[PDB]
Design an enzyme around this catalytic site. Structure first.
Site, mmCIF file in Angstrom:
data_model
loop_
_atom_site.group_PDB
_atom_site.id
_atom_site.type_symbol
_atom_site.label_atom_id
_atom_site.label_comp_id
_atom_site.label_asym_id
_atom_site.label_seq_id
_atom_site.Cartn_x
_atom_site.Cartn_y
_atom_site.Cartn_z
ATOM 1 N N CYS A 418 0.611 -1.172 -0.126
ATOM 2 C CA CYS A 418 -0.129 -0.120 0.079
ATOM 3 C C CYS A 418 0.883 1.214 -0.121
ATOM 4 C CB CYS A 418 -1.042 0.128 1.131
ATOM 5 S SG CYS A 418 -2.198 -1.325 1.086
ATOM 6 N N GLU A 420 4.152 1.394 1.895
ATOM 7 C CA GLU A 420 5.320 0.842 2.568
ATOM 8 C C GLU A 420 6.708 1.460 1.975
ATOM 9 O OE1 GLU A 420 3.148 -2.849 3.107
ATOM 10 O OE2 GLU A 420 2.152 -0.873 2.511
#
Length: 764
Positions: A418, A420
C-alpha cells in the site's frame, strides 16, 4: 482496444476457485526431500512446482505466464497454516469477505491428504509454540496484532535491473561461480537450482506456444504465438533487448516468484525507470508505438490475475485483495534531478485503458515535477479508481537518510504494498509485521482511572504514553517471533538472490542478507486519539461539565441515555477535531505519534536492523475500531477508527481539503519511515474540465510543499455508491480506493462500503 477489453472480461468471466495445486505439488516434493536442509527443501519444492504445474496461454494473451490456468485462484498454503483452512472449508462461498468456490472433491483432498500432513509441522505451529504468555495476553487486550503468521511474508521488491540487464544465462554463470567458491553454502546451491529451474519453466511455455501456433488457424494469432515462443526461448538465457522481451522475462519471473512465496506485495519498483532502455530500443528498431502500448495494457491485465487467500479474520484487516503489484513513476535521478520519462506517461495512459485495481500505480512527486506529468497524473486520478496514488520525494528521501540509507539508494526508493517505503532490490523491511491500536491503549487507560480522585489531565497523558511504551515492547517481541518463524520455516532463496546484498553475504533475506533490514509497525487511530483527548480535556478538566467518572459512565452506556446523546453531541460539535488545521488538537496527534515513533526505533530485529514506525491501515481500521468502546471523540462503541492512517475521522474535517493537508503536515513525518497514508475524496463535479485538472495539480503542488508523505483520492458521488449497494449486479466493475489499494466496491463488506461513503466529499 477490443483485445484488451476481452482479456479483462476473461479474468472475471468465471467464479474464483480455491486451488490446491501449489499445495499438492509442494507437499509431493516435501515427501521426497525429507532429511535435507530447510532452504534446499524450499527450493526443490519450487522447482517441483515449476516442472509439474499445469500451464496454459489464455486466449489472445500477449504475455505468457499465470500462476494457475483458472483466473484469480485462491492458492492455499497449508504449509504455513493448515488450521484456518480446515475450519473454513465449507464456508468459502459464503464468508463475509473474499469468497471463493471450492469443489467437494477438493474439500475431501484437503481433509484426507493435506491437513493430516501439515498439521503439527506448519509455520503457524512453530510460531504458536514460540508465542510467549505476555504477548498472547497483549494480543487479547486488542492493543496490537501480529501479521503474516499464517502465510508467506512477501512485502518486498526484487532487483529488476539485475534481472533485465543480465538475463538468466549470466545470472546462472555468476551463481555457478559462487557455488564453486563456497560449495557448502546451501543458499547458493538453492539459488542456482532455482535459476536453472526458472529457465526450464520458461522453456515449457516456449514449447507450448510453438505447439499452439501450428494448431492455430488465425494468421494474426499464429504470428503472435510464434513470437511468444521465440521471445520465451530468448528469455531462457539472453538479456532482453526489446520491450516485449523485457516485459515477458519480467512477467515470467514474477509468476515464478509467486510459486516460491505465495504472498502479497511482491511489488514492482520503478517500472518506468528500469524498463525505459527496452522501450527505447523497440522504438529505435521501428516497432509500432501502438502495439507497445497495447502490450503494456495487456501486462496491466496480467497483474490482475493474482489474488491472495486469507482467513476470515485476516480478511477483516486486508479486505478485497490488496495484491500490491505497486509500481512508482517519475521521481528523482541519482543526482537529484527529475526522472520523469516517456514511460512515466505511457504507464498512466495504459492504465486509463484498463482501470483495474492492479497495477497499484503511484506517482513520485517533488519540487521538480513538470506540469504536463502533473496534469496527466490529475487526469488519471479523475477516472475515480484511486490510482495513481502520490508519494512525496521531499520527505521520503530524508526519512530514508535518517535510517542510514545512502543518498543514491534513497533517491531510488519505491513502495511495497500500500504505502510502505522501501529501497527496491536492497531491502527486507517486514513492512507490515504488526498493527498497533492507539485508541484501545487510550480506552484501557481511561477505565483504569475510574474512581481515581487524584487524576489530572497531564497524569492521564503520562499514563497513556507509558502504556504505549509498554505495549510497543511486546509488539516487538511478537514481531521478532514471526520474523524467526519465517527464517526457520520459509526462506525464499530465489527471491533473495535478487536482493542486495544477499549474494555478497551468502545469506537469505530471512537471515539478514539484505542491505537494509527493517521491521515495519503501524500506529493506527491517531485522529481518534487526539480528538478524544482534546474533547476530554475541555469537557472534564477545563470546563468541568462532567467529572471523569461521570464521563466514563456515559461511555459505558454508549451514549444511549437522553443526556448521553446530548453529551455526545457536545463532544463531537463543541470541541475541535484533527484535520481542520487547529493547532491545539493537531499538536496532540503530533506529540503522541512522535512518542510512538521514538519508542519503536529503539528496538532491534534479529537481522541486525531496527524497527521502523509507520501509520497506515489497509482495511484494519474497521476491525480495530470494532473492539474499542465508546470514546470521548463521540465514537459509538465498535465504530471504525479513522480510515487510512493519517486521515481525519469520518466527517470531522469541516474546513476543506487544504486544512486536512495542513493538519497532517504538523506531524513529524520524517520519522515515519515505514510509510503513511492519507485518504481524501473529491466530488466528480469539482474536477470537471481542464480547470478541474489544474485545481488538482495545484493541490498536489501544495501537498508536495507541505511535506506530507502520501495522498490518494476517491472521486465518486455518494449516490453512485448507494446505488451500487442497492443493485450490486449493475456495478460489478465499480472500483474504489480503500486504503493504499483499490478494490471492487460490491465485493467489500458493508462496513467498508460505509467507510468510503461516509468520508467527506471535498470541493477544490
Amino acid at each position: 482496444t477490443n483485445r484488451i477489453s476481452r482479456l479483462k472480461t476473461a479474468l472475471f468471466a468465471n467464479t474464483r476457485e480455491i486451488s490446491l495445486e501449489r499445495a499438492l505439488l509442494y507437499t509431493a516434493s516435501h515427501r521426497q526431500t525429507e532429511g535435507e536442509p530447510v532452504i534446499l527443501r524450499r527450493a526443490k519444492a519450487t522447482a517441483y512446482i515449476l516442472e509439474h504445474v499445469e500451464i496454459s496461454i489464455r486466449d489472445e494473451e500477449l504475455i505468457a505466464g499465470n500462476r494457475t490456468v483458472k483466473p484469480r485462484a485462491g492458492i492455499m498454503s497449508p504449509e504455513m497454516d493448515p488450521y484456518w483452512l480446515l475450519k473454513e472449508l465449507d464456508q468459502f462461498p459464503t464468508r463475509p469477505q473474499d469468497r471463493f468456490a471450492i469443489s467437494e472433491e477438493d474439500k475431501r483432498i484437503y481433509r484426507e491428504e493435506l491437513f493430516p500432513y501439515w498439521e503439527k509441522r506448519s509455520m503457524k505451529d512453530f510460531i504458536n509454540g514460540q508465542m510467549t504468555d505476555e504477548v498472547k495476553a497483549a494480543t487479547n487486550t486488542q492493543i496490537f496484532s501480529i501479521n503474516q503468521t499464517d502465510k508467506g511474508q512477501g512485502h518486498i521488491i526484487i532487483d529488476y535491473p539485475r534481472l533485465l540487464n543480465h538475463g538468466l544465462g549470466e545470472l546462472v554463470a555468476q551463481m555457478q561461480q559462487h557455488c564453486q567458491q563456497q560449495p557448502e553454502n546451501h543458499f547458493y546451491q538453492a539459488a542456482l537450482l532455482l535459476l536453472e529451474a526458472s529457465q526450464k519453466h520458461i522453456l515449457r511455455y516456449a514449447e507450448l506456444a510453438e505447439t499452439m501456433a501450428a494448431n492455430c488457424t488465425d494468421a494474426q494469432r499464429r504470428e503472435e504465438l510464434l513470437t511468444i515462443a521465440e521471445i520465451s526461448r530468448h528469455n531462457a538465457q539472453h538479456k532482453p533487448q526489446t520491450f516485449w522481451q523485457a516485459c515477458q522475462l519480467f512477467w515470467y519471473m514474477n509468476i515464478i516468484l509467486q510459486y516460491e512465496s505465495n504472498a502479497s506485495s511482491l511489488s514492482l519498483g520503478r517500472f518506468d525507470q528500469y524498463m525505459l532502455p527496452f522501450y527505447q530500443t523497440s522504438l529505435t528498431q521501428g516497432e509500432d508505438a501502438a502495439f507497445l502500448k497495447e502490450l503494456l495494457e495487456s501486462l496491466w491485465v496480467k497483474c490482475n490475475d493474482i489474488v491472495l487467500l486469507r482467513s476470515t479474520s485476516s480478511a477483516r484487516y486486508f479486505a478485497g485483495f490488496p495484491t500490491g503489484y505497486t509500481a512508482l513513476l517519475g521521481g528523482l535521478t541519482e543526482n537529484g534531478r527529475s526522472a520523469v520519462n516517456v514511460l512515466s506517461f505511457l504507464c498512466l495512459d495504459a492504465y486509463q485503458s484498463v482501470q483495474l485495481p492492479q497495477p497499484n500505480l503511484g506517482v513520485r512527486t517533488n519540487a521538480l515535477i513538470d506540469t504536463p506529468f502533473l496534469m496527466k497524473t490529475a487526469e488519471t486520478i479523475r477516472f475515480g479508481t484511486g490510482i495513481p496514488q502520490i508519494f512525496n520525494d521531499e520527505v521520503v528521501v530524508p526519512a530514508f537518510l535518517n535510517r542510514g540509507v545512502s543518498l543514491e539508494d534513497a533517491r531510488d526508493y519505491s513502495v511495497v504494498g500500500c504505502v510502505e517505503l522501501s529501497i527496491p532490490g536492497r531491502t527486507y523491511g517486514l513492512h507490515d509485521i504488526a498493527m498497533f491500536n492507539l485508541l484501545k491503549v487510550m480506552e484501557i487507560c481511561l477505565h483504569e482511572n475510574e474512581g481515581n480522585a487524584a487524576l489530572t489531565y497531564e497524569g492521564l497523558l503520562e499514563q497513556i504514553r507509558a502504556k504505549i511504551s509498554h505495549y510497543i515492547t511486546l509488539m516487538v517481541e511478537g514481531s521478532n517471533i514471526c520474523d524467526i518463524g519465517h527464517r526457520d520455516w520459509a526462506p525464499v532463496p530465489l527471491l533473495s538472490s535478487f536482493i542486495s546484498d544477499c549474494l555478497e553475504k551468502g545469506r537469505d533475506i530471512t537471515d539478514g542478507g539484505a542491505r537494509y533490514n527493517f521491521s515495519g509497525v503501524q500506529g493506527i487511530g491517531i485522529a481518534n486519539l487526539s480528538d478524544s483527548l482534546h474533547a476530554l480535556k475541555g469537557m472534564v478538566f477545563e470546563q468541568q461539565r462532567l467529572s471523569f467518572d461521570e464521563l466514563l459512565s456515559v461511555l459505558k452506556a454508549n451514549f444511549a441515555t437522553p443526556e448521553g446523546e446530548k453529551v455526545r453531541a457536545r463532544l463531537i460539535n463543541r470541541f475541535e477535531k484533527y484535520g481542520n488545521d487547529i493547532d491545539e488538537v493537531d499538536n496532540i496527534s503530533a506529540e503522541l505519534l512522535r512518542h510512538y515513533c521514538k519508542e519503536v526505533e529503539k528496538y532491534q530485529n534479529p537481522r541486525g536492523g531496527y524497527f521502523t514506525p509507520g501509520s497506515y491501515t489497509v482495511s484494519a481500521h474497521v476491525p480495530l475500531g470494532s473492539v474499542v468502546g465508546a470514546t470521548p471523540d463521540g465514537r459509538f462503541a465498535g465504530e471504525q477508527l479513522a480510515d487510512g492512517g493519517l486521515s481525519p475521522m469520518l466527517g470531522q474535517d469541516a474546513q476543506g481539503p487544504t486544512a486536512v493537508l495542513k493538519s497532517v503536515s504538523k506531524l513529524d513525518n520524517t520519522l515515519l519511515s515505514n510509510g503513511t497514508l492519507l485518504n481524501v475524496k473529491f466530488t466528480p463535479a469539482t474536477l470537471e474540465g481542464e480547470a478541474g485538472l489544474r485545481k488538482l495539480a495545484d493541490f498536489l503542488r501544495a501537498f508536495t510543499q507541505l511535506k506530507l508523505q502520501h495522498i490518494q483520492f476517491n472521486v465518486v458521488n455518494a449516490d453512485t455508491l448507494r446505488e451500487a449497494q442497492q443493485r450490486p449486479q449493475d456495478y460489478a466493475g465499480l472500483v474504489v480506493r480503500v486504503a493504499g489499494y483499490s478494490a471492487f466496491f460490491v465485493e467489500l463488506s458493508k462496513e467498508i462500503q460505509d467507510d468510503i461513503i461516509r468520508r467527506t466529499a471535498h470541493q477544490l
